[PDB]
Amino acid sequence: ANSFLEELRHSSLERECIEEICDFEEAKEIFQN
């Protein structure tokens, strides 16, 4: 999930998709595929 300026932090599976719900683009920014 995104909060103000959080997206300047490096992506994090834990922070973004386990502690919070992540959308597909946030997941892709973790996978870097």
Binding site: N2, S3, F4, L5, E7, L8
Partner: protein, 172 residues
């Protein structure tokens, strides 16, 4: 008659990491403040001492936080969507108090490279595109601005609350 505070900020980005700012503010037709410098050392001055030292230093602090957050947002749109540099952005914003006593009218318009880009609509505290050219940049920038308390309600509050009290206190 129409009492107003206008603020102007022009931000010249050589690349995503370096910006030169130049801005000023006016109460009616009277120039009251100037702002100028690189992101690393931006000077902010009240040309007359409208605010006492403590209160001025608090204003200056909020303005410096704002500039770092504004730069952050520009860097984030680049990292997420790619911007073409160099680019210049102009923000023109203010509050206008009608003499009859209706609610202050406020605005915050952003232009990029001299063209209209997005602007704030204070009724529901939402940003809209001013350009009709669609693009991933505009879409993403609006998504970010419309996503957060900071860039919606706190921004509205600066215009409708902070700016309006400053007009009422310092003209009179």
């Amino acid at each position: 008659g129409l009492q107003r505070l206008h603020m102007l900020q022009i931000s010249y980005f050589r690349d995503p990491y370096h910006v030169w700012y130049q801005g000023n503010a006016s109460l009616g037709g009277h120039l009251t403040h100037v702002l100028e410098g690189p992101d690393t050392n931006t000077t902010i001055i009240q040309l007359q001492p409208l605010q006492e030292p403590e209160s001025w230093a608090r204003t200056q602090s909020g303005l410096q936080s704002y500039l770092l957050q504004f730069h952050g947002l520009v860097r984030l749109v680049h990292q997420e969507r790619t911007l073409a540099f160099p680019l210049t952005i102009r923000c023109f914003l203010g509050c206008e108090l009608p003499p009859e006593g209706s609610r202050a009218h406020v605005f915050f318009e952003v232009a990029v490279n001299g063209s209209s880009f997005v602007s704030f609509r204070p009724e529901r505290a939402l940003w809209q595109a001013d350009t009709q050219v669609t693009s991933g940049v505009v879409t993403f920038t609006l998504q970010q601005l419309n996503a957060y308390n900071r860039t919606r309600y706190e921004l509205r509050e600066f215009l409708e609350d902070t700016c309006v009290q400053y007009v009422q206190k310092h003209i009179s």
